[PDB]
Structure 1
């Protein structure tokens, strides 16, 4: 395989490494490295801890971006400081359980997998060692996404280009943290020690936390997402295990690929869309008003009470034609 090689420097979510949309490049071998990290992390503002397992230290793992026809060559590294075997499975790839059957590595090992990007869209990747370990590693944080763009960039299905000014990757994670008898969340010394209690809870199918970017409030405050009025923003949303229903409060999905695959035309003008568990989707919106927006799953219990809220802070001029407060709060006549 004698194609040019291009290295990518991955960046932590919700940011995305620099890439072209439409390109005049032909197929390349695009080289990525992912290093697995098992670590105890804090997941909420009360200080609840969690035995996480991650690609590159983040939940979600970083977004990888290539074009249709590229070959994706991933070096997966499992350092000796980890305790368990791991692998990687790409929903974008064809064969060998997505790559999982060719990438099982013990602590202290690495492996190199190449796959051809023959299908366009956004796709989940995740660890999948085998058996009951599969859901456990996924819900512990071992999932991310890849985006495979058409070489001509995105289009609206009617012959018009859609170009985004920026892209963000929102990875949603369902977490299962057991409680003790008095009702406090339990802490564990190792992923192995968390396993028995965690599996019992997992099989009851109700998460304790549903978070974006690994923690309650991760995409708020100094880390709110940003835009300006007039900017077209692409939001890639993934959920490797459980359904989600994204919604931009105060906005819309102007162009939405809820099943996430660019060979299908987008739907237009959505209020709320649906990300099937085990998939990624994408939505584009051109901001028309300044101020704060919330990006949520629109099970509002999960959004407000279990962690699944991000903010956008948008700069620009208020449009009174679109919306105006005609009369401020006042006493009823």
Structure 2
């Protein structure tokens, strides 16, 4: 796209604020930003806020979201679809034109780990170019295992294809498949979907801890066979809904857009890989590391 030649819009922080006991404002941008998805490989991503996947959103069950999208793309319209919400797609997930803003309001009444993404036709194009992310909705009554958890992180799986190539997007294998982590608390890492950052700077934990991961596979196209090497998942909640409780899974099948809360114990010091067990995808990037130490 001629109007994207040379464009590299600096990342803008997510803006969020509570405005009532059950109402939150969120303000994001749609923007065009160069991301290093593999060593030496820059993708001029279509993004929310200059991150791909986008910034993490966390709300409470029962919160109504008042969402603003500021479209900084000079020529392409963009939109937002939160899977967490009940909305009219043809009124509430509609396009915001270049250089304009739009505000939409809708309730998040279901707990879980939900995908969000741009909803602009062709959706495949907007997702594959980078406009995806996760919104967590915290359950009003928690999870039955909350008292057991020592540490938590968010991981997101996505694919990258040949740049803005709709033939490849529809008909080709992924060039890269990657994990990213999004911060839940100060000091947590916050990364983009790339083949290396979570290998080089592993997530951290202590020996004997029970770890919770909030996970979502945003696709666009692949399913995920989520596995942590050297452990077994003690508890799994499908889509992060507390009622969808499985125990003792070695690997969690995630559809495209599929989420879960998973919990596991790291019993020994060492480095623990985190993979999709579809090993072709792992080989093309989708391995993160968790470094477990005595401190």
Tell me the TM-score normalized by structure 1. 0.74
The partner residue of 2:248 within 260, 265, 269 is 269
Q: Check whether the contact 1:154–1:163 (CA below 8 A) recurs between aligned residues.
A: no
Aligned: 1:237 with 2:230: no
**Alpha-carbon deviation of 1:82?**
3.7
Q: Secondary structure at the match of 1:87?
A: coil
Largest Rg, 1 or 2: 1
For 1:264 and 1:200, how far apart are their aligned partners in 2? 40
For residue 46 of structure 2, what is the aligned residue in structure 1?
53
Aligned: 1:31 with 2:25: yes
For residue 76 of structure 1, what is the aligned residue in structure 2?
69
Q: Check whether the contact 1:100–1:127 (CA below 8 A) recurs between aligned residues.
A: no
- Kindly report the root-mean-square deviation, in angstroms, between the aligned alpha carbons of the 2 structures: 2.4
In the TM superposition, what whole-angstrom CA distance separates every residue of 1:40-86 from its partner, at most 9, and x where no partner exists? 332112x123231111211211221122111122221112x543110
Q: Check whether the contact 2:128–2:159 (CA below 8 A) recurs between aligned residues.
A: yes
For residue 133 of structure 2, what is the aligned residue in structure 1?
144
Q: Check whether the contact 1:175–1:210 (CA below 8 A) recurs between aligned residues.
A: yes
Q: Check whether the contact 2:14–2:49 (CA below 8 A) recurs between aligned residues.
A: no
Q: Secondary structure at the match of 2:166?
A: helix
For residue 168 of structure 2, what is the aligned residue in structure 1?
201
For 2:159 and 2:290, how far apart are their aligned partners in 1? 22
Aligned: 1:125 with 2:116: yes
Greater shift after overlay, 136-145 or 263-272? 263-272
Aligned: 1:168 with 2:153: yes
Aligned residues: 267
For 1:100 and 1:216, how far apart are their aligned partners in 2? 37
Tell me the TM-score normalized by structure 2. 0.83
For 2:61 and 2:23, how far apart are their aligned partners in 1? 12
**Alpha-carbon deviation of 1:283?**
0.7
For 1:294 and 1:48, how far apart are their aligned partners in 2? 23
For 1:239 and 1:219, how far apart are their aligned partners in 2? 16
Q: Secondary structure at the match of 1:254?
A: strand
Q: Check whether the contact 1:38–1:82 (CA below 8 A) recurs between aligned residues.
A: no
The partner residue of 1:88 within 80, 89, 92 is 80
Q: What does residue range 9-20 of structure 1 map to in structure 2 within 5 Å?
A: 10=14
For residue 229 of structure 2, what is the aligned residue in structure 1?
249
Q: Check whether the contact 1:100–1:129 (CA below 8 A) recurs between aligned residues.
A: no
Q: Check whether the contact 2:144–2:242 (CA below 8 A) recurs between aligned residues.
A: no
Q: Check whether the contact 2:110–2:139 (CA below 8 A) recurs between aligned residues.
A: no
CA gap 1:35/1:163 in 2 versus in 1, 3 angstroms: farther
**Alpha-carbon deviation of 1:212?**
1.4
Q: Check whether the contact 2:92–2:105 (CA below 8 A) recurs between aligned residues.
A: no
Aligned: 1:299 with 2:278: yes
For 1:123 and 1:82, how far apart are their aligned partners in 2? 29
In the TM superposition, what whole-angstrom CA distance separates every residue of 1:295-318 from its partner, at most 9, and x where no partner exists? 010012211x2110100111129x
**Alpha-carbon deviation of 1:164?**
3.3
**Alpha-carbon deviation of 1:27?**
3.9
More strand by share: 2
For residue 312 of structure 1, what is the aligned residue in structure 2?
290
